[PDB]
């Protein structure tokens, strides 16, 4: 194997060892459930929807929600596009540039929604008949292994670069088990479960952080908050 | 921190800013109990007698006097603002916020220098003076 594959094996092994070593038993706690509480109110209904449909709904809702966050602050010179790219409509003055400076909360939510939009859009391309199942799986495998280039959340929370490297390492581990024999290089691998797991586990830990950041931001939008000794 | 005069509502803040035509009104927005505010207030207290000919120092609690929080963006623990004849005097400290000193100053002489620079520049009708020292770094090494 090449050197990159060997180091990929060693890094996957390193993180396996670290997970096994740092593992502490889960703590006893009261059974809090979020969606059960949401369903207990009159503001939430239940249905059974196609996954592609609810994915499109989530993409549209995230776009509308960030766009409302932008239009609340009267930033008409800024444009949030549907691939979740903040764009300057015109050449912006320095006073406009400093008023168009968002925190890592907005940009991290924006980039997570960008990744979700890419995934759901690949699925939509599958459902429209433009792209077939094998190329859909290859596209998802490419997406979950190339998040460092399709999106840009590494520049607002750089620790997730750890995930990106992992998603590259797995890409090696799978590829050199996949591209053996009559199978050469080029696209075609669709074993996207490996990187999909990694990004789900990233979201597992980021959900409380992003929720806290966005709660602070939205509370701030609506006038709310939530040599020593001598 | 407690020797300096305190301003107890926004009207008193506005009158203190208006009551001076020949001295720089230096106002510290913050909470007396805050560590950064106490550090800044020690320095302001140690220089308050030395600059009484061209500067007056008042303190303001940003909870007991909340009117200037949205107006002056008083969302830092400590904030030091300079006014000369009912005009906010911006100062280019090199920190990217030319409107206030939103940190605690460790030197008695640096704040005297800043106050004197603000006074001398504002007498000439300048809305922005330039601080004698760049605070874009801390020169630690």
């Amino acid at each position: 194997q090449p050197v990159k594959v060997r180091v990929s094996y060693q890094k996957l092994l390193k993180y396996y060892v670290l997970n096994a070593l740092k593992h502490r038993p889960p703590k006893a706690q009261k059974k809090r459930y979020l969606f059960r509480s949401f369903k207990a109110t009159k503001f939430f209904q239940s249905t059974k929807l196609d996954w592609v449909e609810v994915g499109l709904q989530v993409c549209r809702q995230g776009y509308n929600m960030l766009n409302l966050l932008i239009h609340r602050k009267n930033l008409n010179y800024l444009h949030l596009d549907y691939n979740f790219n903040l764009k300057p409509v015109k050449t912006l003055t320095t006073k406009e540039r400093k008023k168009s400076r968002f925190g890592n909360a907005f940009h991290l939510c924006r980039e997570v929604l960008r990744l979700t939009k890419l995934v759901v859009d690949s699925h939509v391309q599958y459902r429209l008949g433009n792209v077939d199942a094998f190329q859909l799986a290859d596209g998802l495998q490419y997406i979950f292994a190339h998040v460092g280039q399709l999106t840009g959340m590494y520049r607002y929370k750089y620790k997730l670069m750890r995930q990106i490297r992992m998603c590259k390492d797995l890409k090696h581990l799978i590829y050199y088990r996949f591209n053996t024999g009559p199978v050469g290089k080029g696209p075609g691998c669709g074993f996207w479960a490996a990187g999909w797991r990694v990004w789900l586990f990233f979201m597992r830990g980021i959900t409380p952080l992003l929720e806290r950041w966005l709660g602070n931001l939205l509370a701030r939008q609506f006038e709310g908050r939530h040599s020593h000794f001598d | 921190s407690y020797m300096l005069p305190h301003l107890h509502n926004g009207w008193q803040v506005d009158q203190a800013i208006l009551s001076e035509e020949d001295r720089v009104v230096v106002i510290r927005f913050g909470h007396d109990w805050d560590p950064t505010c106490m550090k800044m207030d020690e320095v302001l207290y140690s220089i308050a007698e030395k600059v009484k000919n061209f500067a007056v120092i008042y303190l303001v609690d940003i909870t007991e006097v909340p009117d200037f929080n949205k107006m002056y963006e008083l969302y830092d623990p400590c904030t030091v603002m300079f006014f000369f004849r009912n005009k906010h005097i911006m100062i280019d400290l090199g920190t990217g916020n030319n409107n206030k000193i939103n940190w605690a100053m460790e030197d008695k002489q640096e704040m005297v220098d800043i106050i004197e620079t603000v006074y001398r520049g504002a007498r000439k009708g300048r809305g922005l003076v330039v601080s004698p020292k760049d605070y874009s770094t801390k020169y630690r090494y």
């Binding site: 602050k73 701030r220 939008q221 006038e223 | 926004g10 009207w11 008193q12 009117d67 200037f68 963006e73």
Partner: peptide, 30 residues
């Protein structure tokens, strides 16, 4: 004056004439 009370009808933000900064976006609700 020090110790004096505030007048009833008075906005102490622009009662003398002074405008804000808007240094950035995600600090304060514009």
């Amino acid at each position: 004056f020090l110790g004096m009370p505030a007048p009833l009808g008075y906005v102490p933000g622009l009662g003398r004439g002074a405008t804000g900064f808007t240094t950035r976006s995600d600090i304060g609700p514009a």
